[PDB]
């Protein structure tokens with residue numbers, strides 16, 4: 001059900017990431033470096049366990065989870081959140097909760113590209129990834 005998402009993906013477009021980061025309280029210097037990074041996202045599965053790596057010249061993260069089962073996560077910007085990832089309408093929907101706040105990270109495949117939509121507050125960022133062979 002999550003198979004088309006699997007593989008190695010490289011960032012090729014980003015819209016409103018600064019707005020999203022600023023909404024989360026990320027400092028200007030971090031936003032500045034992040035605005036010039038092009039991460040690689042690697043999504044792998046082993047049975048019911050997905051592992052999602054995000055690699056860059058700036059920061060790296062890795063999470064492992066089962067769909068539909070809450071997990072603790074420490075984000076790239078050091079938020080300690082309660083997370084859950086599901087499939088909804090064919091999209092991979094990652095919801096993070098902390099301090100009564102929420103943000104969603106929604107991934108969907110359009111014409112073979114992976115679109116990541118990040119929403120926090122009123123900020124909506126769209127990042128496009130292309131698959132590495």
Ligand SMILES: CCCCCCCC/C=C/CCCCCCCC(=O)O
Nearest residue numbers: 034039054056059060061076077127
């Ligand atoms: C791990 C790569 C880090 C990139 C720099 C991020 C700076 C700190 C910002 C944190 C806010 C949360 C961002 C989540 C999305 C990361 C980029 C993406 O996967 O397309």
